[PDB]
Amino acid sequence: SMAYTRYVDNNFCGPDGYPLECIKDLLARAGKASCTLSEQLDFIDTKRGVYCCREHEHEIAWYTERSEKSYELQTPFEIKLAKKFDTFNGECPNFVFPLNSIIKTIQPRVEKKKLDGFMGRIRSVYPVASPNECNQMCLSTLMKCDHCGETSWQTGDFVKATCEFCGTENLTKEGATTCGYLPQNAVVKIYCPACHNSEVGPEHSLAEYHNESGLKTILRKGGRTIAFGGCVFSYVGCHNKCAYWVPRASANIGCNHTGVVGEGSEGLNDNLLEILQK
Numbered sequence: 001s002m003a004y005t006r007y008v009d010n011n012f013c014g015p016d017g018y019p020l021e022c023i024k025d026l027l028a029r030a031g032k033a034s035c036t037l038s039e040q041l042d043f044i045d046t047k048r049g050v051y052c053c054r055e056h057e058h059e060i061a062w063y064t065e066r067s068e069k070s071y072e073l074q075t076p077f078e079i080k081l082a083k084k085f086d087t088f089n090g091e092c093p094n095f096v097f098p099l100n101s102i103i104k105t106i107q108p109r110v111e112k113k114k115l116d117g118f119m120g121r122i123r124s125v126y127p128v129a130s131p132n133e134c135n136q137m138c139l140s141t142l143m144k145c146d147h148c149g150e151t152s153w154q155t156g157d158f159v160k161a162t163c164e165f166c167g168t169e170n171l172t173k174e175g176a177t178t179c180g181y182l183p184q185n186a187v188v189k190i191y192c193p194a195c196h197n198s199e200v201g202p203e204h205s206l207a208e209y210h211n212e213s214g215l216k217t218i219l220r221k222g223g224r225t226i227a228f229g230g231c232v233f234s235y236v237g238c239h240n241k242c243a244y245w246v247p248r249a250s251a252n253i254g255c256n257h258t259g260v261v262g263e264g265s266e267g268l269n270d271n272l273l274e275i276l277q278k
């Protein structure tokens with residue numbers, strides 16, 4: 001969903017599950033910005049499909065089932081199923097979800113008399129009496145350790161994980177990720193710079209959190225988003241100077257496992273599937 005990227009699903013959305021600017025422009029110029037996805041994809045095929053943008057090339061790596069919402073409005077949250085495109089030969093690039101997966105998106109909760117502070121914010125996602133009922137997820141990154149130089153599944157969150165071998169804390173590196181088995185009231189709870197630092201404070205805005213978080217997000221339709229381990233995370237709010245993210249979208253490859261995404265994920269998922277059968 002950058003300016004241009006080659007690889008798309010059969011619905012012409014990018015590897016991050018978001019629409020391409022170039023395709024959005026093409027649809028706008030033809031006066032089909034607010035048409036259904038089916039009608040926009042009919043028109044894209046009229047413009048020669050993956051060659052629809054004359055000045056660069058696209059290539060379909062994934063089959064995905066999405067909603068009928070206008071291309072411009074499509075998000076990872078609109079994906080329901082993800083697999084390799086039947087007619088694409090070779091290894092797929094990195095994709096927001098694991099192959100042969102089903103996706104569930106969190107519905108925003110309705111509440112007559114909304115609670116104050118974090119309780120109102122978290123109850124917009126999960127029906128919990130307290131924050132204690134939320135279960136923090138196990139986000140694992142297959143990466144090399146700064147200390148012992150072993151490459152293993154290090155467990156933690158989006159930003160940091162711990163080496164099982166030597167116990168050294170490592171910043172999350174590029175490589176295969178997983179959110180493991182999705183628990184009930186699944187949350188990611190991380191240190192909040194905006195809460196802790198004396199310049200901002202724990203009554204900071206939603207905007208202020210993202211400004212000070214040090215995490216890479218883009219303000220886009222569906223809100224600011226972080227993709228990790230076969231989930232797409234949205235920011236709920238802060239409780240006790242800790243930022244709470246929820247898997248607004250979560251993949252399921254079987255047994256409620258969020259599966260593996262990133263370098264080598266196809267091999268790792270195939271190996272994982274043979275365990276989950278048992």
Ligand SMILES: [Zn+2]
Pocket residue numbers: 004020022023053056058
């Ligand atoms: Zn294009």
Ligand SMILES: [Zn+2]
Pocket residue numbers: 145146147148149150163164165166167168
């Ligand atoms: Zn280590």
Ligand SMILES: [Zn+2]
Pocket residue numbers: 192193194195196202204209238241242243
């Ligand atoms: Zn905060």
